């Protein structure tokens, strides 16, 4: 699970894309997405 305020999967990020429960993966930019 990706941490809170962490990048959860933009184009090119194939790591922890699944946010911790309670946090939502919000795509902010095409490559920048953050678990909030
Ligand atoms: C939360 O923690 C993860 C690693 O555990 C980071 O990838 C993220 O940027 C944030 O610091």
Curated annotation (Swiss-Prot):
CBM1 domain span: 1-36
Residues shown, of full length: 478 to 513 of 513
Domain comment (free text): The enzyme consists of two functional domains, a catalytic core joined to a carbohydrate-binding domain (CBM) by a serine-, threonine-, and proline-rich, highly glycosylated linker sequence.
Protein family membership: Belongs to the glycosyl hydrolase 7 (cellulase C) family.
Note: T.reesei produces two different exocellobiohydrolases. They are unique in that they can hydrolyze crystalline cellulose in the absence of endoglucanases.
Primary role: Exocellobiohydrolases (CBH) that catalyzes the hydrolysis of 1,4-beta-D-glucosidic bonds in cellulose to release the disaccharide cellobiose. The degradation of cellulose involves an interplay between different cellulolytic enzymes. Hydrolysis starts with endoglucanases (EGs), which cut internal beta-1,4-glucosidic bonds in cellulose to reduce the polymerization degree of the substrate and create new chain ends for exocellobiohydrolases (CBHs). The CBHs release the disaccharide cellobiose from the non-reducing end of the cellulose polymer chain.
Superkingdom, natural source: Eukaryota
Name recorded for this polypeptide: Exoglucanase 1
